[PDB]
Scaffold this motif. Structure first.
Motif, PDB file in Angstrom:
ATOM      1  N   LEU A 335       0.663  -1.286  -0.018  1.00 53.44           N
ATOM      2  CA  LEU A 335       0.043   0.204   0.112  1.00 53.44           C
ATOM      3  C   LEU A 335       0.627   1.262   0.129  1.00 53.44           C
ATOM      4  CD1 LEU A 335      -2.888  -1.103   2.481  1.00 53.44           C
ATOM      5  CD2 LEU A 335      -2.932  -1.230  -0.283  1.00 53.44           C
ATOM      6  N   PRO A 339       3.193  -2.693  -5.265  1.00 53.81           N
ATOM      7  CA  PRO A 339       3.993  -4.328  -5.327  1.00 53.81           C
ATOM      8  C   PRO A 339       5.339  -4.458  -5.960  1.00 53.81           C
ATOM      9  CG  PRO A 339       2.217  -3.848  -7.000  1.00 53.81           C
ATOM     10  CD  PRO A 339       2.145  -2.625  -6.241  1.00 53.81           C
TER      11      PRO A 339
ATOM     12  N   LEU B 297       0.433  -5.511 -10.140  1.00 55.60           N
ATOM     13  CA  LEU B 297       1.074  -4.355 -10.831  1.00 55.60           C
ATOM     14  C   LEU B 297      -0.090  -3.659 -11.665  1.00 55.60           C
ATOM     15  CD1 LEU B 297       4.569  -5.650 -11.942  1.00 55.60           C
ATOM     16  CD2 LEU B 297       4.038  -3.618 -10.295  1.00 55.60           C
ATOM     17  N   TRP B 300      -2.061  -1.503  -9.245  1.00 54.36           N
ATOM     18  CA  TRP B 300      -1.243  -0.364  -8.631  1.00 54.36           C
ATOM     19  C   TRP B 300      -1.166   0.672  -9.573  1.00 54.36           C
ATOM     20  CZ3 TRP B 300      -0.160   1.224  -4.135  1.00 54.36           C
ATOM     21  CH2 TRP B 300       0.878   2.102  -3.846  1.00 54.36           C
ATOM     22  N   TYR B 303      -4.523   2.675  -9.977  1.00 58.62           N
ATOM     23  CA  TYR B 303      -4.367   3.276  -8.694  1.00 58.62           C
ATOM     24  C   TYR B 303      -3.621   4.519  -8.984  1.00 58.62           C
ATOM     25  CZ  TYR B 303      -2.913   4.737  -3.830  1.00 58.62           C
ATOM     26  OH  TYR B 303      -2.634   5.568  -2.735  1.00 58.62           O
ATOM     27  N   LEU B 312      -7.694   0.914  -4.037  1.00 55.44           N
ATOM     28  CA  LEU B 312      -6.579   0.389  -3.079  1.00 55.44           C
ATOM     29  C   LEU B 312      -7.449  -0.583  -1.991  1.00 55.44           C
ATOM     30  CD1 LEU B 312      -4.048   1.477  -2.171  1.00 55.44           C
ATOM     31  CD2 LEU B 312      -4.954   3.083  -0.653  1.00 55.44           C
ATOM     32  N   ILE B 315      -7.069  -3.812  -3.999  1.00 53.89           N
ATOM     33  CA  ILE B 315      -5.707  -4.269  -3.856  1.00 53.89           C
ATOM     34  C   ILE B 315      -5.202  -5.170  -2.588  1.00 53.89           C
ATOM     35  CG2 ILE B 315      -3.004  -3.805  -3.509  1.00 53.89           C
ATOM     36  CD1 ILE B 315      -4.114  -1.248  -5.348  1.00 53.89           C
TER      37      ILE B 315
END
Ligand SMILES: CC(=O)N[C@@H]1[C@@H](O)[C@H](O)[C@@H](CO)O[C@H]1O
Ligand SMILES: CC(=O)N[C@@H]1[C@@H](O)[C@H](O)[C@@H](CO)O[C@H]1O
Lengths: 409, 409
Positions: A335, A339, B297, B300, B303, B312, B315
């Motif tokens: 977070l 990653p 990935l 992310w 995000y 989020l 994830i």
């Protein structure tokens, strides 16, 4: 002058028998060398000698030879009084700052020598104290500086048996305090447990818990088998470093490290540990267990000695808790850093000689935020202290840590 | 004779764009070489070309040059019809065993050649099929043996792009079936994703998902840049093995392996892939991502392209699920073998040339027991198939597995 000592077992529970066995053995050794009981402060939870699981009630042993080390040990700070606050007060020699216990403190003079031995659990930059308490390395160095500035002693030797114990002094232990320190491991290694059930050595068969810790029994067995008016602090360090490395097999051994004032290594050990007049003459690979693995092995052997369902559920709850902590820390890394980046940031180890964390107050705050959302770290949780230190070092804010912890738990 | 092909993408979701891009590129390549559409069966979930996230609606690309590979691809087995049962029926050439789809099968003659290409996710001894379906290696070898015994073809070449794909054939693929096989990785390695956002290569900036897989684009780009009447199966294997090893940096590359009848490596590639009359002449290190890491990935980067709270939380739920599976499998190892023994048993890899599991029906049963208590494995969960195979191999009973899974979940 006068020789003083502070012996501390940072853990409790029958599973952690060895930490109190180590401390009790150190106490007997110091008495045999002529140190007076009034000058030796003992911190032990004191739940072992009369534990319902103890096959030798009222007795504690620290090796397979089975000599009792419990009889005569004073109850200075036991139970709820085994705290970081009392430890600090005792070292400072301030009776008015102690809460509970016997009131015995290290009210030492400038000509005196002090020996400190700690045995239990630890993590990067931290030591355990009983019932999920955490002692931060910089708070311990702060006490040493205060004691030095008050002219409390001539010289001090400190021996620390804990996982990643080198991280308690690396980059933060000053060399100008007349204090020499040795640790069971470097800043990124676990410490090892010895005299475990089912191992050679070969402990008394009635024992279901490990009797001692590798570095601890290396120094104690070395001390009690040599003339300490002849043996130097350096000779002890070398013999302990060799024994603790377990034939340089670091997959079942660790790197004994040294910090502080190395001039003290030239001194004879009797100036700190006393001299036993019985040892006036004189000058194999060990099966060892990881400190963090001993708890599960103890429960498993308890299970096998009736393989019953309550024990199996206890093992599952222990592993599920460790998995929750491991998973939450990993998730926070994801977070905060993304990653693929989370793990290298949280797990990267600084070069030797550098402090674990630049801001120790920020480290305490990251742990506070984490525990407020994810629950208590517990002694196992101390392994994640480098992850918290790395979050501080990366410049990540406390507000962002709050948000990540909230999402994770 | 006639050249046939079966192209299979074993995954779905925009995150897995690359698996369908690889398959569509293989289809275009085969058509350019003269293989007829009626002899090429395509299995693709078909959720990519018109996905709401696709910045080029109705188009699919498989490399940064951006040539569409979707137009003209047949919808043989799509959506719910992308199953192991339909794949097996198609290879066997039995229209009566197919459920749904176009009904196109490999109803081949003894003089015919067949080329099979699979691309997605996998684990030890298993391949993914869309919506948490698992295809077991021995069931695939069983189909090959049945097809061979029915005189279904002269020779067959199979290319498999999946994690630990070598484990699908090691110790179980017979050499007497006129079938030659290559895999993206050995039995204990993950496979690699290429043409990812933020990498060089350098994909079109509007893409948020990876375009291709390393082994897959190595063989396809090799095939389309050579005369296949001159290039052998061996030359392709060597070039793909070199490219997929990524300058022998196995921390970002894998070992391309070969199984089955190696006499087929002497054959010219055009006997399987056709010949493109345009390629009648002719004869850097790549940034790659782990197949299992691409999903996180992708989320992310989604995000970061709005850093929002829903993403989020998505994830966190993904990582918490992976942690649950990883933790449950670890805990089962502890309950069955004891701490310290669980991990070496579940994670030990057999020597190359030995089958992953001695009893494949027991492997399916261990997965069934696990999922009945701990929930679906999902595609990520396929990484734990070696743990299940090792439980079978150790002689542990299904009743004991039931008890351990019950305690763990
Ligand atoms: C930390 C410390 O005491 N360092 C001393 C150093 O200052 C001194 O010059 C030398 C003399 O041998 O011994 C060492
Ligand atoms: C699996 C297979 O076909 N093996 C053959 C072998 O039987 C034969 O003796 C040899 C002749 O070159 O080629 C290889």
């Amino acid at each position: 002058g006068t020789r003083w000592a502070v012996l501390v077992a940072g853990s409790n529970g029958y599973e952690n028998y060895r930490h109190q066995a180590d401390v009790c053995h150190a106490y007997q050794l110091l008495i045999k060398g002529g140190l007076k009981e009034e000058n030796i402060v003992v911190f032990m939870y004191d739940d072992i000698a009369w534990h319902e699981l103890n096959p030798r009630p009222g007795v504690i042993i620290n090796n397979p030879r089975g000599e009792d080390v419990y009889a005569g040990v004073p109850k200075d700070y036991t139970g709820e009084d085994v705290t970081a606050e009392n430890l600090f007060a005792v070292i400072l020699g301030d009776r008015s700052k102690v809460k509970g216990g016997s009131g015995k403190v290290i009210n030492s003079k400038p000509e005196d020598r002090i020996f400190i031995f700690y045995s239990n659990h630890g993590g990067p930059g931290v030591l355990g104290m009983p019932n999920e308490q955490i002692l931060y390395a910089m708070d311990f160095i702060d006490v040493l500086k205060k004691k030095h500035a008050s002219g409390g002693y001539r010289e001090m030797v400190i021996y620390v048996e804990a996982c990643e114990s080198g991280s308690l002094f690396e980059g933060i232990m000053p060399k100008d305090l007349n204090v020499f320190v040795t640790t069971a491991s470097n800043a990124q290694e676990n410490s090892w447990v010895t005299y475990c059930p089912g191992t050679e050595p070969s402990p008394p068969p009635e024992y279901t818990t490990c009797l001692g810790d590798l570095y601890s029994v290396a120094w104690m067995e070395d001390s009690e088998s040599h003339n300490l008016r002849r043996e130097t602090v350096n000779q002890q360090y070398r013999s302990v470093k060799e024994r603790t490395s377990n034939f340089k097999d670091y997959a079942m051994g660790s790197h004994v490290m040294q910090y502080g004032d190395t001039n003290i290594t030239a001194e004879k050990l009797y100036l700190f540990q006393g001299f036993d007049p019985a040892t006036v003459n004189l000058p194999a690979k060990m099966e060892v267990v990881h400190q963090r693995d001993a708890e599960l092995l103890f429960m498993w052997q308890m299970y096998q000695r009736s393989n019953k369902t309550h024990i199996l559920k206890q093992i599952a709850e222990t592993v599920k808790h460790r998995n929750h902590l491991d998973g939450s820390v990993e998730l926070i890394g994801v977070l905060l850093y993304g990653p693929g980046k989370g793990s290298p940031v949280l797990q990267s180890v600084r070069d030797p000689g550098l402090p674990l964390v630049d801001n120790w107050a920020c480290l305490k705050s990251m742990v506070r935020v984490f525990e407020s959302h994810c629950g208590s770290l517990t002694q196992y949780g101390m392994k994640h202290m480098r992850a918290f230190a790395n979050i501080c070092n990366s410049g990540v804010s406390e507000s962002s840590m709050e948000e990540a912890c909230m999402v994770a738990c």
